[PDB]
Amino acid sequence: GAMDHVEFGLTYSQLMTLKDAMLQLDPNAKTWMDIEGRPEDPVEIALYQPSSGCYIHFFREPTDLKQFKQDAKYSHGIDVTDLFATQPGLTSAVIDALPRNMVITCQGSDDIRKLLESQGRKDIKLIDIALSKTDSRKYENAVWDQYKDLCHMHTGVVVEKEEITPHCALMDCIMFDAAVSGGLNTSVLRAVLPRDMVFRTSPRVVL
RNA sequence: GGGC
RNA sequence: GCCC
Ligand SMILES: [Mn+2]
Ligand SMILES: [Zn+2]
């Protein structure tokens, strides 16, 4: 509101922990980014650097719940109850912490661009691989086969009617990279963010 | 064609 | 279904 003036969603302590964690990102390595949800109301964010296997992956509660339940049916299949424990402030904090003039690669750059610009990061350069749906998802099964344990949010049925595999920001990054590289490596990935930064963890008794 |  |  007009009388509310809060600069950050995170405490300085957590902002400093975030800054340190993001030193694991190489400012010059190929970096994929993808989101689920609208750029004005994102619910899942992923960045991925195949060179190290490092990824950033986190969630956000939707503001437009009617649009969300609709988007879930046709794209992401994310159960909204599973988004309760998420850290507010993380989307802005992570985007603000990205290196100046970083080059980010994506599939369909329009939504990624709107998100970054809404966060004042017009300095970030975007490379759109601009593949067909078919070509971009050649390694879709192979990626889910290998990395399913990295995201459990996508349990809703998604339709195109015909049922299709749900869209995950993290699996998307991995499979798009596989498509461009012409193959998928078998390698163990590494989460950049601490678990307690991404979700509300931690009571012995109610009240 | 894309994106959710 | 909605968005470019
Ligand atoms: Mn996308
Ligand atoms: Zn996911």
Residue numbers in the entry: 356 to 515, 522 to 563, 565 to 569
From the paper:
We obtained crystals of NP-C in the presence of an 8-bp dsRNA oligo (5′-GGGCGCCC-3′/3′-CCCGCGGG-5′) with either 5′-OH or 5′-triphosphate (5′-ppp), with the 5′-ppp dsRNA complex diffracted to a much higher resolution (1.68 Å). These crystals belong to a space group of P41212 with unit cell dimensions of a = 46.74 Å, b = 46.74 Å, c = 217.31 Å, and α = β = γ = 90°. Single asymmetric unit cells contain one NP-C monomer bound to an RNA substrate. The electrostatic surface potential map shows that the dsRNA-binding surface, with a surface area of 606 Å2, is highly positively charged. Electron density of the RNA substrate clearly showed the presence of 4 bp (5′-GGGC-3′/3′-CCCG-5′) in the catalytic cavity. For convenience, the 8-bp RNA is numbered as 5′-G1G2G3C4G5C6C7C8–3′. This was because a catalytically active NP-C domain was used in the co-crystallization process and was predicted to have removed the last 4 nucleotides from the 3′ end of the cleaving strand, resulting in an intermediate dsRNA product with a 5′ protruding end of the complementary strand (5′-GGGC-3′/3′-CCCGCGGG-5′). The 4 nucleotides 5′-GGGC-3′ of the cleaving strand were almost completely buried in the catalytic cavity. In particular, the 3′-end ribonucleotide C at position 4 of the cleaving strand was coordinately anchored by several residues: Arg-492 through a water molecule forming a hydrogen bridge with the phosphate group, and Arg-426 and Glu-391 through their side chains forming a hydrogen bond with the 2′- and 3′-oxygen of the ribose of the cytosine ribonucleoside, respectively. Remarkably, the 3′-end ribonucleotide C of the cleaving strand was positioned precisely in the deep pocket of the catalytic site, with the terminal bond of the ribonucleotide completely exposed to the catalytic residues for hydrolysis.
